[PDB]
Design a protein around this nucleic acid. Structure first.
Ligand SMILES: Nc1nc2c(ncn2[C@H]2C[C@H](O)[C@@H](COP(=O)(O)NP(=O)(O)OP(=O)(O)O)O2)c(=O)[nH]1
Ligand SMILES: [Mg+2]
Ligand SMILES: [Mg+2]
Ligand code: NA
Ligand code: NA
Length: 326
DNA sequence: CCGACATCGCATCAGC
DNA sequence: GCTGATGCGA
DNA sequence: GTCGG
């Protein structure tokens, strides 16, 4: 945490621009800046030194100079005192309440947790579950709990069909000592890029997990992506575990390596890698890496036999999951 | 200077 | 109902 | 907000 003060500031500015200003590119700018500073192996002494890093320009160098000199940012201090910004920033912390809805709720006089709790009928389903578990979703998950959760998910999936493979990705796969949620990549040989020979592949799994009272709530659910809530079982006389966010993503079996690269992240690592791909003349998603033709239209999927193959195409040296925490 | 900034699944709405 | 845009989270 | 062309 060499430059924690600076990266915290930039993250709060990023959050401001996303939630309040609804300026997603500023949000991404601040996030890129914070990320590149987070991995810089020196205690930054000035905005000039920081400006050397890619993603840090003039405006952010100035803010860093102000922050180093005073320990504060006046811009952020005023934002913190703004009632409307404070209200919007708070509401967006509920899952399902984004910048537009947050501002709309404020317009209608709904701006506190207590307000939300007495206006449950003005929330959509996602938002109501997000409110329900507002407290729990703030808490992080120790890796030890992540390991118990893994063991339940993998074993219940096996019981449905032994040909399923479930892989825990996200921050867990990057070796994090704690995670914000659980991310599960799912494959089955019946679902490939060429065909789907069995329906309800994801549904079966979701249902098995509900059956054993592991999955407790659903935020959204389609053919390939589940987003919901789960909970570890507790023992006699002990306080229950917090409820946790869990996502399950079914990916075509033959596109596992693009899928696991994507779901391992980080989110900023993925954006940076896909950015780099574009400069090298490719586009990468969770399914494929494709060349960009003379037009700027994606060509046919390239052969991929490992995560490293994807790195190879764009002339990046391979990075292990633990080194992708950007 | 200025266009372009990764990419996509699900829920919801607007228009037909 | 279909299509396409928007919001949201990932 | 930043930066390559
Ligand atoms: N390409 C791309 N991938 C993303 C993005 N957001 C998430 N992913 C991919 C890569 C992410 O790693 C993965 C899961 O997203 P989380 O659970 O939101 N983040 P994580 O598990 O890393 O951290 P933690 O849960 O401890 O907070 O989905 C995105 O904006 N873009
Ligand atoms: Mg996660
Ligand atoms: Mg997640
Ligand atoms: Na820079
Ligand atoms: Na939210």
């Amino acid at each position: 945490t060499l430059n924690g003060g600076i990266t915290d500031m930039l993250t709060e500015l990023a959050n401001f621009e996303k939630n309040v200003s609804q300026a997603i590119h500023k949000y991404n700018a601040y996030r890129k800046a914070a990320s590149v500073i987070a991995k810089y192996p020196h205690k930054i002494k000035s905005g000039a030194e920081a400006k050397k890093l890619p993603g840090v320009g003039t405006k952010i160098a100035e803010k860093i100079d102000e922050f180093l000199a005073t320990g504060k940012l006046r811009k952020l201090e005023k934002i913190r005192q703004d009632d409307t910004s404070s209200s919007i920033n708070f509401l967006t912390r509920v899952s399902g309440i984004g910048p537009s809805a947050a501002r709309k709720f404020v317009d209608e006089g709904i701006k506190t947790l207590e307000d939300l709790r007495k206006n449950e009928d003005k929330l959509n389903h996602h938002q109501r579950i997000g409110l329900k578990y507002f407290g729990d979703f703030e808490k992080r998950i120790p890796r030890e709990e992540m390991l118990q959760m893994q063991d339940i998910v993998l074993n219940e999936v096996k019981k449905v069909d032994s040909e399923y493979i479930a892989t825990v990705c996200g921050s867990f796969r990057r070796g994090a000592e704690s995670s914000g949620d659980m991310d599960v990549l799912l494959t089955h040989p019946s679902f490939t890029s060429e065909s789907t020979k069995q329906p309800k592949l994801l549904h079966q799994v979701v249902e098995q997990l509900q059956k054993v009272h592991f999955i407790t709530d659903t935020l959204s659910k389609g053919e390939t992506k589940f987003m919901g809530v789960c909970q570890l079982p507790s023992k006699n006389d002990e306080k229950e575990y917090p409820h946790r966010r869990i996502d399950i993503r079914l990916i075509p079996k033959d596109q596992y390596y693009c899928g696991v690269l994507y779901f391992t992240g980080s989110d900023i690592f993925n954006k940076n890698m896909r950015a780099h791909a574009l400069e090298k003349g490719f586009t990468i998603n969770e399914y494929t890496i494709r060349p960009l033709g003379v037009t700027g239209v994606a060509g046919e999927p390239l052969p991929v036999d490992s995560e490293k193959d994807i790195f190879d195409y764009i002339q990046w040296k391979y990075r292990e999951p633990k080194d992708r925490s950007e």
